[PDB]
Design a protein around this ligand. Sequence first.
Ligand SMILES: O=C1CC[C@]2(c3ccccc3)NCCCN12
Ligand SMILES: O=C1CC[C@]2(c3ccccc3)NCCCN12
Lengths: 300, 237
Amino acid sequence: MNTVPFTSAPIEVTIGIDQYSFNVKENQPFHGIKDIPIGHVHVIHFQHADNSSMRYGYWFDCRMGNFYIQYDPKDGLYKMMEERDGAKFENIVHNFKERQMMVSYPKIDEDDTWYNLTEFVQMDKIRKIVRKDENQFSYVDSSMTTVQENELSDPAHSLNYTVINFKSREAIRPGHEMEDFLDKSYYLNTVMLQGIFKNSSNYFGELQFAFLNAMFFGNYGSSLQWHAMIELICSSATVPKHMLDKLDEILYYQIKTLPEQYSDILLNERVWNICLYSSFQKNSLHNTEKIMENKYPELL
Amino acid sequence: GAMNSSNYAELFNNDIKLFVDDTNVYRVTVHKTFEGNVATKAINGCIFTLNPKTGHLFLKIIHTSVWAGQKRLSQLAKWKTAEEVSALVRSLPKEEQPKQIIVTRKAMLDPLEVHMLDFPNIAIRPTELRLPFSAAMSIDKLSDVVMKATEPQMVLFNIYDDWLDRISSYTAFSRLTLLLRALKTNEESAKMILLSDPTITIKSYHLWPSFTDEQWITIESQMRDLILTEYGRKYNV
Ligand SMILES: O=C1CC[C@]2(c3ccccc3)NCCCN12
Ligand SMILES: O=C1CC[C@]2(c3ccccc3)NCCCN12
């Protein structure tokens, strides 16, 4: 189990750690989060009490370094930093645990939710989407736009998701215009899976990461990316059986976890109705269709 | 965006543009089979591609052999239209290629956009107008060449005859739409109006009779009449 200590909490803030969250009052004696499960990526995120505008946060993996949070009063936000002095870090964490000034990552033992949401998400791939090479962790916020959004404006602060565009020369082979537009298998299997992602695990990892950025930061370009990657699979007549079964599990846990009050803005009626009821894969997503119909029958 | 009443004048500016109408591409007769079921028999169709400024009509005849062994023909017909329009653009010199293609049905937008990805600078646009180009097959010489075709074939027509010698492209396209609206509302009456006087003939190289200016105003009024009439007969007014 690993720890992310905080130097202090000078401003009132709601702090999230993965799917959990808790309120910290201005100058409350809070010094971080302990017992974080090893083996998964994690995200620690913030919403200031004064300005609920801008949710922001950091993706990280405790196996890649000792990380801590420190408020910056010039830039006005909680910043993740790496501590290179290992002895200094262990000494700090040990003292904070002794004084019991840390919250415990509150995982229930039955609960595989976080694993199920991050199964294919790797920190190495996160850092290729979020380019900031001098850090081992990655910053995301509500306002960051994607590379495809910038084509339709600061390149350094963008989300470099894989561009998917159904009406593009990449998606459409000359002389197969109708075939490739109505059945996207070529684009899924040859262009994207064989050509760009190399395997389905990397594809699912990007999909899972796009969902999580949409849910935790309200990042619109991330929501667009999540829906596009779902639609590309659902609009392909030829998809490996293992990929469909895994997609059903992935989406099931995403829909299960999504906040009920956010479904109106985070779920695209057209994509979901197409995928569940009109697409080639309309009969292949049993778990997802069942939870969607019982939880969001309005959307459909 | 979409073409509507508010921007009707754009059609007659000097940017090359084409209307594409696919209504008559996939045509069938419905009939009973010996067992008393229903079946369709396709007949020849055509794509109607028209430059509204010049009157140039590129009439691509769709021979029934293109449907042989194919499924979902109404959907295929939209993609076949898009393929043929794309091939026509590619066959024209660059300075003759359109800057805009306006489709008369919104269902052509995606098929045409996809077939024209190579031409990112050609704008594909819908229209809010209810243009009467489906009645093109009520023009006898056009229907005759479509029905006689035994193979795919492109046939070139000036749909305005020689009118642009005497009138503007806005008055010509306005007249063409009036004649086609009439033919669509009551074909027999419209054709009666156009042909009643045997002394006004259709030249071998024309589609419509050789009316004087004065006779065209009479004709247009009579077509202005018919369309209100059949509107009363239909609606009881
Ligand atoms: O007016 C014209 C110009 C040449 C043309 C033509 C060319 C392209 C499209 C329609 C018409 N060919 C014969 C028909 C009349 N002709
Ligand atoms: O029958 C009529 C009356 C209106 C119209 C017209 C004008 C623009 C569009 C269509 C029809 N005026 C001039 C053309 C003949 N017309």
